[PDB]
Amino acid sequence: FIYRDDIGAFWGIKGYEELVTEVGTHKGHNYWPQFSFLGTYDSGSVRRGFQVFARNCGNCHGMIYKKYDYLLDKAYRQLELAQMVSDFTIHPAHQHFKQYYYQEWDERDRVICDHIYPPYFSQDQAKNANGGVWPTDFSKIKLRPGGINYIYNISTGYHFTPPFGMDVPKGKYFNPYFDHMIIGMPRQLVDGLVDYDDGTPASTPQMAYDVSNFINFMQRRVGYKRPDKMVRYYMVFTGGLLILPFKYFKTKAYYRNLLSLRWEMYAVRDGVYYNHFKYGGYNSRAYQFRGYFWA
Amino acid sequence: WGIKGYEELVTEVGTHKGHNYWPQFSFLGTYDSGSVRRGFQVFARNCGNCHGMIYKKYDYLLDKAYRQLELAQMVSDFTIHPAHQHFKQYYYQEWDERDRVICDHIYPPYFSQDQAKNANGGVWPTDFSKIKLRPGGINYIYNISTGYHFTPPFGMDVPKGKYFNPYFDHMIIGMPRQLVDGLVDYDDGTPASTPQMAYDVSNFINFMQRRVGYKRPDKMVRYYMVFTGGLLILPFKYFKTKAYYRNLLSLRWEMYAVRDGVYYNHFKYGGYNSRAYQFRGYFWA
Amino acid sequence: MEWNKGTYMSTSIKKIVQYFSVMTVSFHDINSLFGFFTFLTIASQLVSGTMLAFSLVPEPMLIPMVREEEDVEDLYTDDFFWLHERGVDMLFIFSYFHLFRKIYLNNFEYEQEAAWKSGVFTFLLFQVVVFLGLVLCCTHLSDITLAIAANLYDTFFAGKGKFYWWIFTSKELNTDTIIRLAYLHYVLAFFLAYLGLIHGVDMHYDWKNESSMDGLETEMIWFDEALSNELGAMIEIILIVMIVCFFMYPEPEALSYEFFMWGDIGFINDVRFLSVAPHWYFRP
Amino acid sequence: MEWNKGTYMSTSIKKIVQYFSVMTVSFHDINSLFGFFTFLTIASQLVSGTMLAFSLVPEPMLIPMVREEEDVEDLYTDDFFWLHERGVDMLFIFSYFHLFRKIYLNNFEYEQEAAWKSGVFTFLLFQVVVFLGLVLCCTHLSDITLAIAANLYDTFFAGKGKFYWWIFTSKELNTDTIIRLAYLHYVLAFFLAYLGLIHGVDMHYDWKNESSMDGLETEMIWFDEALSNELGAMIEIILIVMIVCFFMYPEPEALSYEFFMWGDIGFINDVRFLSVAPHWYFRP
C-alpha cells in the first residue's frame, strides 16, 4: 500500500523508468494558469503559441484530429485567423477522408475549417524526410509524462551529456525527457527564432511555454473546456452542501417523528381460542416450496 | 406502359421493338468469357480514359475472362495517385504516383469530378457504376455507341461542341463518336469493327454491375431449382393437409331422445367468458 | 414446460404501477441503498449511452476523428462521455459493495436462494457489457483486451478451428467486428437493465437493514418517504466521491494508467508493451 | 390506473408455450392464412435485416460503396438484400389482402373490436418502419421521401421553429440523420414484431373461416395439423408469385420505375430527375 520513490515508478506505475517524468508535477511545481484554482487560459500565451507552431513546429508535426477554428473567441478573430491560415497550402492528397466534398485537384490556400495537416502527404513520407523517425502527431499528446510539462521539458532540456556506456549515434540526440533518452529531433527553439506580433521578447523558455500552452489548449478533456467544467463542479458542490440540511430534515426528522409511537399490551382472557394463529398463514413462495421442501 | 418520365430519347429498341441477343439473358445462358475479355480491353484502350468505375475493383473478372498474373500486368500498365483515393485509411502511405494493382478501384485519370468536367468542356463523363439504370439496360451502351448516324430534324439547332444522338436525353450529347473501325487490336485476333467493339464493351460493363451481372445466371439457375423443388413438394403437402382433414371429417353422428326427467340445469346456469372483465360494468346494464 | 411452476411476479404495467405505489420499505441505513444507487446509475448509463451512440460511426479508422469533431461542435457530447465513464466506475463500486454486504450478512439460506443466482448472472452480464464498451474504445488497450478475450475463447476449443470468427473475426478491430460489438454492446446493455429490474423486483421477500430482526411492524411508504432518502444518500455519496477525487487526483499528474490509451489502432502500429495497464476493475 | 382492468393474456414464456401447445384451429382454407403469412415474412424480415445491419456503415458517403463491395467479397449479402426487398413487397401484399378480407367479412363488431385496433396499430408501425427503411437507401428517392416527411412535420407544427431537428436535422440525409433513422428502423422493427405477437394473441376469441357459421365442434391441433397447412400455403403463394414475376418482369427491361434510384445523394448533385417515382406501395 506504500510505494518507493527512488525506483523511478511514480506512485506504483511501472514502465517509465527509462526517462525523467516527475519534474513538472511531483518534483517541482511548474505553474500553468489554466491548471490553478479558478484559473483559465491566457489568450496572449495561446496566441503566441499558435504563432510559434505555425512558424516552426508545423513544418514537421501535425494535429490531424483538429482544425484551425478551435482558436476562435479565445485566441484569434475570424479574419486574422483566415489570413494566417491562408499563409499555408493544402492538397487533395492531404485529406484523410476525401469524399465528394473536396473537388480540388491541386494546391490551394488553407481555410480555418481545414484539419491541421503537416506538409507531408503521409506518415511514411514524414519518416523518409526525417531520417527514419516520424514526427509524432500532437492530437493526443496529452497522454505523456506530465502532459503540458512534457512538451515544455522536451522543448527544453538539451543541456546534458550522455553517461559512460551510453552512445549517441549520428542523427540522434541526447534528451533525458524522451523515452530511452535518445531522440531524433535536433534542437529547434533558439533565442529570437520567432518574431512575436505583440512584441514579447522571444527566448527559448518563452517559446516553449507558449507552444506548450497552445498544444494543451487544443487537447480534449484537458484543454479549452476544463476551467468552465471545474467552475461547474464548484457550483454543483455548493448546491449539494446547501441542500444537505433540507434532506436531513425530510428523511431523518420525518423518520424520528414517525417512530414516536405509544404501545400498550393488555391481558385477554375471554375464553376465545387463537384458531386464527393456529390455522392461519400465507406465503407467496408456496408455489416453490410445495412438493419439494419439508415432506 | 405508363412510364411518362422519358418522352424524347429512344428507349425501346433494345428490348421491346426488336430483340437484341445477349448470352447472359438467355434461358440457360451465361457470359461469354472472350467477349468480356475483349470488352475490358476496349474499356482500357478508350473508355477508361474518361469514365472510370468508382464503386468497382479491378479484381473483378478474376477466375472468369482473366487470370491473376495477366490482369496484374494489364492493370500495372496504368497509373494511380493518392489524390485519387476516395478514402485513405492509413493504408495508402505512398506520396507519389504508382502503378495500379488488381485490388484497386477503377478510378478515372482525373483526381475529381470537377476536374473531369473542366477537362471535358463542362460535361462530366458519367460513372459506369450503376449505369444499368438507363433505358434499355445493357442495350443503352450499345445504342449510345452506335447512335451517331442519324441527322437532326428541321430547327433542331444542335449547339456548338455537342453532337446528335437519338438515344441520349434531349437527343443531344456532349460525347464525340468514339468507336471507329479498327480502333482496338484484340489479343485473340477478332476483327475490330464498331458493332463488335460496342458489343464487347457492353458485355463487360454489364458484367460489372451488381444485381444483373456476374451473379445473375447462377441466381436464375437457383430459382429454377427451387421452383422444381416446390413443384415436387406439391403432392405431399396436399396428401398431408387435405387428405388428413378429409379423413378426420369422416365422422358418424347419432342423436337420440332423452326423456329421463332431468332438467338442463347445466345449459341454464352455465357459461364462462374470456372477455367477461371487458364486458362487466360496461355492457348490457 | 412441466418443470416450471410459473413466475413469482408477472411483469405487467398495471401491476408494476400498483406494486410500486403500495410498496413499503422498513427503516434502514445508508449501507442498504447500494441497489437503488446501482439502478440510478444504470438508467443514467442508458441515457448517456444513447446520446453517445447517436454520434459514434462504427468505423475504426474514423472513431477518434469523429470523437474529436463532435466535442468541439457540440455542447454536451463530452459531458455525456464523462458521465458514461463515471457511471461505469460507480456501477463497479456499488456492485462490489453490494456483493460484499451480502457476503457479510450471510444471505446464503433457501429464502435468499432466488436473489443470489439472478444477481450473479446480472454481474456476469455487466462485466460482458463493460468488456464490449472497452473494446469499442478503439485504442491499443482495446486491441489488447480483444486479443485476450479471443485467446481465452479459443482455449475452450483448444486452438483448433476458427470458431471465434462470427464475433471476433481475425482477432483485430476491423469494421465488421466493430459494428458487431457495438450493436451487441447496445442490445446487451438494455437486456442488462431488464435483468437488473427483475433482480430488484425479487428483493421484497426478505428485505432487512441489518442482520438483526428489529421487530417493527410499521414501515414507510416507498414513493416519497423512501425515494427522498435514496436520492439524498445518492447526493451525499456523490459529494464524498467528488471530495476524494478532487483532493486525490491532481491535474496534471506525473504518471497515469491511462497513458496506454494514447495509441490508436491503425494510425499507430507500434505498441509500447512496457506500460500495459487496464482500468482498475480488470486490474485484479 | 383505476380505469384499467388488466390484459387479455400474460406474455410469460411458459404461458405462451403452453397456449401454443394446446391451441386448436378449426378447418380453414387459403383465404384465412394471410395473418400467418405476414408472421412468417416478418420473421424472415427480422433475420435478413439483422444480416444487412451487420454490414451497413451509417455514413451516407460510404453506403453505396460498401453495398457494392460487400456483394463481391461475400456470398450472401446480396441474397439477404434481395430477401429484404421482396419481404417488404410480400408484407405489403399480405397485409392489404388480410385487411381486405376482414373488411369483406365485416369484422367491425364489438366482440372482435380488440383484434381490430391492435391490427391497425401494428399496420401503422409497419408503415413507419417501411418509411425509415426507404430513407436508409441514400438515393435521390430517399432524399425526396425525407423532404416530404419533413415538410409534413413542419406543416403540422405550422412552419414555426425547428421542431423536426431532433429526428430530421436539416431535412436532408446527412450522417446525423442517417444514424438516428437507422437505429429507429431497427428498434421499431423489433417493436413491430412484439406488437404483431400481441395481435396474434388477441385473435382466438372470434375466429371464423367464413362469415357463415359452420357448426363443427372438432378442431385440429395447431402444432402440426395446421402449421403444415400454413407452410404449404406459403409455398403455394411463393410459387404463384414466382410465376407471375417471371411472366411479367422480363430481363433486360427498358423504361422502368427503378430509373430514379440511379443517383446518389452525395456522388450526384448536379442531376435531379424531375419525374420522380416511388415504390408501388407509397404510390397511392
Binding site: - | - | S170, L173, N174, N269 | -
Partner: peptide, 17 residues
Amino acid sequence: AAARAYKFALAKARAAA
C-alpha cells in the same frame, strides 16, 4: 471500405512508395 476482415483489416502492412 478497405478496412474489413476480407480486405486489409487494420493496415498493419501498408502500401508505401
